[PDB]
Every structure is written in C-alpha cells, then in structure tokens.
Amino acid sequence: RTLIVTTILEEPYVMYRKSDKPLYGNDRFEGYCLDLLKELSNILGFLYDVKLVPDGKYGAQNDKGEWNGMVKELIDHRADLAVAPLTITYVREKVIDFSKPFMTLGISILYRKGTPIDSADDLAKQTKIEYGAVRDGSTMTFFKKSKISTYEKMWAFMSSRQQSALVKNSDEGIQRVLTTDYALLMESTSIEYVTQRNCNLTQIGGLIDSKGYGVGTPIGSPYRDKITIAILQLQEEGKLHMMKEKWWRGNGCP
Amino acid sequence: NRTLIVTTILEEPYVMYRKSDKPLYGNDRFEGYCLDLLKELSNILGFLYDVKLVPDGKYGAQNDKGEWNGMVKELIDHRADLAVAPLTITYVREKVIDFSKPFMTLGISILYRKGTPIDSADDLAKQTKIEYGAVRDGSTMTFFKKSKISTYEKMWAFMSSRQQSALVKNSDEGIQRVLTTDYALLMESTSIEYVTQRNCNLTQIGGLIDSKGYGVGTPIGSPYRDKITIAILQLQEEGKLHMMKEKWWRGNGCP
Numbered sequence A: 001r002t003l004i005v006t007t008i009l010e011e012p013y014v015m016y017r018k019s020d021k022p023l024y025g026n027d028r029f030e031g032y033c034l035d036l037l038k039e040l041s042n043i044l045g046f047l048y049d050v051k052l053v054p055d056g057k058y059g060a061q062n063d064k065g066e067w068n069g070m071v072k073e074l075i076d077h078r079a080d081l082a083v084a085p086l087t088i089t090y091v092r093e094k095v096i097d098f099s100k101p102f103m104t105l106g107i108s109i110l111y112r113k114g115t116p117i118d119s120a121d122d123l124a125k126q127t128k129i130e131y132g133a134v135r136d137g138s139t140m141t142f143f144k145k146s147k148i149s150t151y152e153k154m155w156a157f158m159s160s161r162q163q164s165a166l167v168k169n170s171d172e173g174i175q176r177v178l179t180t181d182y183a184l185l186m187e188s189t190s191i192e193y194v195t196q197r198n199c200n201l202t203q204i205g206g207l208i209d210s211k212g213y214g215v216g217t218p219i220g221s222p223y224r225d226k227i228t229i230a231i232l233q234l235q236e237e238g239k240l241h242m243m244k245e246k247w248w249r250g251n252g253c254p
Numbered sequence B: 001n002r003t004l005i006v007t008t009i010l011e012e013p014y015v016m017y018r019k020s021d022k023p024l025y026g027n028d029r030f031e032g033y034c035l036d037l038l039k040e041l042s043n044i045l046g047f048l049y050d051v052k053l054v055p056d057g058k059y060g061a062q063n064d065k066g067e068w069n070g071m072v073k074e075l076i077d078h079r080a081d082l083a084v085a086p087l088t089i090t091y092v093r094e095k096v097i098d099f100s101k102p103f104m105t106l107g108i109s110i111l112y113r114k115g116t117p118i119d120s121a122d123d124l125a126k127q128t129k130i131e132y133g134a135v136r137d138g139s140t141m142t143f144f145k146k147s148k149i150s151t152y153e154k155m156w157a158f159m160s161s162r163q164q165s166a167l168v169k170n171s172d173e174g175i176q177r178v179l180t181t182d183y184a185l186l187m188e189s190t191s192i193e194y195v196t197q198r199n200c201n202l203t204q205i206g207g208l209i210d211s212k213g214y215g216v217g218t219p220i221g222s223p224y225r226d227k228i229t230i231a232i233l234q235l236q237e238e239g240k241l242h243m244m245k246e247k248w249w250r251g252n253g254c255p
C-alpha cells in the first residue's frame, strides 16, 4: 500500500538535499515537488517511496513506438505516481492518466539582456542568432510537431546540421546563452526561476503556447482522480501559489 | 451510434441564440465558442449530438441540504452525456462529476471603470466606499464564501453583508451596475476580456486572484471524458482553441 513515486532531478522541483551526513529514503530529496507530494500524501493518506527514474528521462517515444523515462515507468507499473515537472501533452495523455495540472506555463525564450530581440518571430526571421532547445522534452517535441508557420520554420533551423542548436539539459542551455549569441527556448516557469537568480538573463516575449504540469499515473489508476481533487483544492486554498513563491524567490533581480 | 445529449446554458459568447428572420430548429438554433468546440469534438471523436438548454438555467451549486442543481445535476442524474459550457472546474464539483481537462484557463479578477486609483483586490478589501461583489450564489461568489485567505475572507464578509446586496442577479446586471454606479464586479477574467473589448470605459483591475479552467463535464465513469481530454489537448497544441477564442472575442476596437 506504500506508493512508489518516480521523479527526476530538476531544480527547484527535485534536488538532492545539501547535507553534512549521508541521507536516506525520502529525506535525500527536497524541492517544490517534494512539498507537493507531502501535501498530497497527507490529504489522501498514503505513504510513499521516492525513486529517481533510472534512465534519467521525462518520457518520449523512439522511431517506432517505445516509451522511456518516467512515462515508461508508469506504463510498466514500476511506479504508481510520477511527481515531476512533467508536461501534459496529448501524445503522453494517450498512454498514461494525468491528473489535472498543478502548474500552468508555456514555452518562452531565455536570452541575455540588452538586445532588441522581442519575440519568437524576430528569431525565426534571421540566422545570425542561434536558438534551440533541450532534446526530447516537451519543448523540442512541440517545435518538431508544429504546423504553425513560425514554429515549423524554427524547427527546421533547430533540427538542421545534425541538431547542433540543441542542448542536452537546461544547465548547458543556460551556459550557452551566457557565453554565446544563443537564445534558449524554455518553459516559462524555469525562465522565471533562472532570471531571478541570474540578473544577466531575461525572458524574451510572452508564452508561445499554453500547457500544464500534471502528476502521472498508469492508465486506469484509482489514484488519479483523488490526486486531481486534492490538487484542485490545494490550488483554491492558495497553497500551490505559496509553494511556488517559496521555491522561486531566489536572490531577486530587477 | 446513439446521439449524445449535450446540456448547456445561454452565455455570451459561449452559447447564444443565432440571429434569423425565420424560426430555427435543433442545433442550428445556437452559435458561439462552445458550439464550435462541440463541432470540433464531434468531428474528432465521431459522435452525433443534440444540444439541450439546462431546464433550470443554472450552472451547478448545492443548496442548504447539499443537493445539486443545474448542469451538474443533469450529469449526476444521467440526463445528459456531456456539459459543454463555461463551467468552472472546482474540487467540489469534480467530486461529483468527471471533468475533462480545461479547454480554457482563467481566474477571478476585477471589472471596474477606467480612471480610478484602484489597482488590486487588496485596495478594494481595505475600504468600504466603493461597493464590490459578484454574481449572487455564483461560482465566483462561492470562491469568496469558502476562502480562508485573509483578504478574500475580508471581502466576503463585506460582500455578504446586508442580505448579500453587493451581489448581483447575473453578469449583465453586474455590468450595468459597474457602468451606472461606483461598483466593482468580481468576474472571471475571460469574461472581463470579452466585456472590455465592447465597453471602452471599463477595464480589468489587477491580475488573476486565482487560477482555474473551464472543462467539459461528464457523468462519473463516462467513457467520453478521457477521449475528450485528449481531443482538447490536441486542439490546444495545434493552436485551434486560441483561434476559436480570437474569433468570438475580437471586438470592433477601442479608439
């Protein structure tokens, strides 16, 4: 009856706690998602064991059909819940049962300060500034699948030259923005996070799409609806808003 | 394939009587954002449907005895297969019906006249000269009624005083009350956008007080809920929902 929770290291949602001594079990971790999981477990009355997804991926398909990451963990019933910044997409929703979103966001642009660039359109209609995304997350998958003129055009640039405009993780993307003439396409809530800790960076433009993070469960899970209900309540009570502010504060930038 | 019964409610610009010089029949009677959404869903999922106005003309709330009414009750009692309307996904409602994921996201905000120094809910809550309220026994009102958040608790107490006279019968009345008197209406943000496109002396004050969505309602256990959620997710990603909103919201301009 103790639930297995699959998740992934991603600041500030899930991080190894800083410690002078070895930590064990759930105490090894901290972050927004750990806080959310505590609230959920209290409300619904379950125990849980947090387990990092072994392959270190969120979840995508390969050339012919097979899934990986936390999405596959759910499909195989190697996990009961996935509590991470896991984007609710229709392709994923076809293979797992997502709760309703605990956070809403969209793709936006991370870039250095001091430029005239103001929108995705600006990037798309030029080639002097490089731009790209982290591989195999919902962000790359968005551009790859898009039939929307500008984003289709952006994908062609991004996917060209054996995908040299893409990066392996957000941290590398961030360093690339800091060091070179490069703009990173990134989920807005992570842009918010980073820009309040590094005053040299800023968001460019608004959100190019709209979507949410949801708790994942296997198709047919009896916990999904209960989790949705708890989330809706936590949102209404202002507790999700408080949780976000707790983890996003950072040092602060103008 | 059995034709689905879709309960809904007249609410501009989601669901409206179409303008015709001759009598209209069946689904052709109505138009609006929700009709377009419904047409997309039926094409994608391959179902036929009959649109039926909710007889009691209510969204869905509980009386003193916990009893539901409105489209919520229609779903619980299996008198409709789907509810396609600007129906707010709340935890209280989600307990008794099965909501699809939201086809539109929004929050409570403030509708008020341009030109005032008022900038937030907090500004309203700490004073008593400017009247403020919500649609009586509506979902926005219910948020305040139930809130344990200090500022919103304070607003509800003010709102609820004088046998709920700061509450208005409906949105239309609230709008006219904003236009005629010194009154601010707590209203769902997507409706504020609609109104301010057409009433150039009015504006939204401050940001969203909360965060929520409108979803398609289905009875608990419905086979259609997850299929619809999947269809909505896809329409959203494809940008079709945004186009649909643009279509119905765009006004003639404020020069």
Ligand SMILES: N[C@@H](Cc1cc(Cl)c([N+](=O)[O-])cc1CCC(=O)O)C(=O)O
Binding pocket: A010, A011, A013, A058, A059, A085, A086, A087, A088, A134, A135, A136, A137, A138, A139, A140, A170, A186, A187, A190
């Ligand atoms: N939400 C993504 C996973 C993800 C989450 C976060 Cl929180 C960040 N990030 O902190 O910049 C990055 C990514 C992966 C790049 C992406 O797709 O945005 C998914 O569901 O695949």
Ligand SMILES: N[C@@H](Cc1cc(Cl)c([N+](=O)[O-])cc1CCC(=O)O)C(=O)O
Binding pocket: B011, B012, B014, B059, B060, B086, B087, B088, B089, B134, B135, B138, B139, B140, B141, B171, B186, B187, B188, B191
């Ligand atoms: N979303 C509300 C129904 C509703 C929808 C709209 Cl679209 C408007 N409106 O145009 O101002 C009003 C209302 C009811 C007043 C309210 O709850 O604010 C519910 O789910 O009960």
Ligand SMILES: [Cl-]
Binding pocket: A098, A099, A100, A228, B099, B100, B101, B229
């Ligand atoms: Cl759902």
